[PDB]
């Protein structure tokens, strides 16, 4: 067997195929030759591993895009929340201011209701002193007129 | 075995080529290769296959995590919309409750100010009645006194 | 060499390389020997698949971290949303309590104003009667005085 470290089936630039080769053992100790059908079988797996890596890559890109979409929506939630927070605060201000000035107009109106009840009391006093001054006057015109009348009939 | 090919057998009676030393594995190698070299590669391809299947599972779990998040985000959207709507409902209840009270409070404003025009009309009509009583009692005293003074009739000196 | 199931190019421990082997047919029926550049081409693809699987594992690991950080924004939004739910119900009750209290004040002012109307009316009726009593008393003492002197010039 030619060449003493090597068995040659041609020369550089004039290579030969080796044909009618039985398939060899495929193991970590095999020193059998390998034929093309054995490389083909392996290449079929590799192709399938490659097609599968491509499908996973497409999947992983879309997952990443969905995560970014979800992030966009979390941030719209945040804005909406801040806006509700702000509208609560302005609605807080508008409640007490409005009730504050409803309460100021209640106190002004009680002040003049209290003044009106005072005047009604005072008017009611001097209205009863009048009902007496008018009946003591009425009695003393009667007494007086008929005392004078009495000194007329004395004649 | 011409000068295109070399044959170790025939169809149906192929032969294994045995005691083959490992050949150079490079992009110009014209060496035969042996079965432990193909074995070495096939082990890597097995490992890659196994690793793709682990990776697939992780991708599957990630997808389930993402849909969990989506579900919570949707719950946040709902509650936010319920808050948004309670706030408008409260804002419209507060406008109608203040305006109804400010309306009853200004119908009182007006009816009280009419009571003050009436207390002023009573107070100075009552102040004429006081001076009418005085000038009435004065003219009574003055009119009886001058009748009594018409005793001049009966005057035994 | 030939041992009828095998062709030998060496022996155990003194195996030889076959050289100047032209590329065999790669196909599922092929009985061509394969050479080193044919296995090298395939291993190149296996290396790329291995590189791709690692990159993808790294990408999938960053998305897992991304997802985790978003979880934390979601639970913060839930805190904020809950705070807002409380503040709104707290504000609802303050608004109800505040406008109920102001309503009480307005009814007790309405009470003392229609009493003021009842009393201002009563005063006016008692006051227009005084206008009655003062004018009749006037022309009743006018009538009394002028008949006493009507009779006292009868002398
Ligand atoms: Cl959210
Ligand atoms: Cl692979
Ligand atoms: Cl909210
Ligand atoms: Cl009043
Ligand atoms: Zn990508
Ligand atoms: Zn064998």
Residue numbers in the entry:
A (entry chain C), C (entry chain B): 299 to 453
B (entry chain A): 300 to 456
Copy text from the publication.
They bind extracellular matrix molecules and inhibit the classical and alternative pathways of the complement cascade by recruiting complement regulators C3d and C4b binding protein. TAAs are anchored in the bacterial outer membrane by a 12-stranded β-barrel (the translocation domain) comprised of four strands from each monomer, from where the passenger domain is exposed to the extracellular environment. The passenger domain consists of an N-terminal β-strand head domain followed by the neck domain and a coiled-coil stalk.
The asymmetric unit of the crystal contained one trimer of UspA1299–452, as is typical of a trimeric autotransporter adhesin. There are, however, two disruptions from the heptad pattern: after Gly396 and Gly442 in the d position, there is a Leu that occurs structurally at position a, instead of the canonical polar amino acid at position e to complete the abcdefg heptad pattern. The side chains of Asn347, 375, 382 and 414 in the d positions face the central core of the trimer and the amide nitrogens of their side chains coordinate chloride ions, forming characteristic N@d layers; the distances of those interactions range from 2.90 to 3.61 Å, as expected.
